[PDB]
Amino acid sequence: MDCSTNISPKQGLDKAKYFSGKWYVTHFLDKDPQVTDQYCSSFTPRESDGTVKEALYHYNANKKTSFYNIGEGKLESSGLQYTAKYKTVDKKKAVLKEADEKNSYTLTVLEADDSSALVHICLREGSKDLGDLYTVLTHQKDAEPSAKVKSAVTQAGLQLSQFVGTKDLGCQYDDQFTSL
Numbered sequence: 001m002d003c004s005t006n007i008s009p010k011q012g013l014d015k016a017k018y019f020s021g022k023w024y025v026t027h028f029l030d031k032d033p034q035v036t037d038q039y040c041s042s043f044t045p046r047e048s049d050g051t052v053k054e055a056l057y058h059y060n061a062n063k064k065t066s067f068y069n070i071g072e073g074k075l076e077s078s079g080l081q082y083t084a085k086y087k088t089v090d091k092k093k094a095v096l097k098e099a100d101e102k103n104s105y106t107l108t109v110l111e112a113d114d115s116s117a118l119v120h121i122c123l124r125e126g127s128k129d130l131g132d133l134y135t136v137l138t139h140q141k142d143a144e145p146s147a148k149v150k151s152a153v154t155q156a157g158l159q160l161s162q163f164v165g166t167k168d169l170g171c172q173y174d175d176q177f178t179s180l
């Protein structure tokens with residue numbers, strides 16, 4: 001399922017609010033009905049002079065497995081949006097696999113305040129699109145997203161009730177990895 005082509009970052013967002021601390025996905029919306037496994041995710045995005053680098057963590061709640069990555073990209077001029085390439089690393093941040101130049105993901109920030117954020121992610125594997133992925137984030141695990149971010153969800157044409165809540169999945173996180 002192809003990703004939406006009508007996704008743009010919110011104008012006027014302050015980078016400092018998004019590129020700080022660590023983020024936990026509290027709710028997510030995957031539009032592809034063929035998916036089966038549900039994931040938990042946490043990441044730490046940093047930025048310097050328009051260059052973005054982030055440590056990502058995924059935990060497969062169904063198969064009880066996890067994987068780590070390091071994404072690197074550049075900030076678009078338009079807004080808080082960037083397309084990054086990613087390498088695969090272990091829990092110690094050692095490189096297990098270099099980045100495949102044909103793969104990428106574009107992350108678009110739709111809203112972000114001091115406690116939460118809403119982002120859109122489009123992952124691509126060369127030519128195949130994995131489909132739209134919307135994720136609500138908070139700095140505190142299982143915390144409640146702000147009213148401001150919930151409003152962003154509505155404005156995005158989505159219903160919070162359709163999102164999957166991760167606080168009930170029995171998530172396992174590696175706070176050591178995202179800390180720092």
Ligand code: HEM
Pocket residue numbers: 025028030038039040041043056058067069071086088105107121123135
């Ligand atoms: C709860 C939220 C999330 C869900 C449901 C989710 C789901 C997925 C799925 C299904 C895969 C494929 C893994 C497999 O082979 O089985 C995956 C891979 C990946 N996701 Fe996510 N993801 C989440 C959050 C994120 C975030 C926050 C980012 C970006 C910052 C992201 C970036 C990626 C990347 C780069 C890969 C590829 C890793 C690799 O192939 O080594 N994901 N995700």
Ligand SMILES: [N]
Pocket residue numbers: 121123133
């Ligand atoms: N993803």
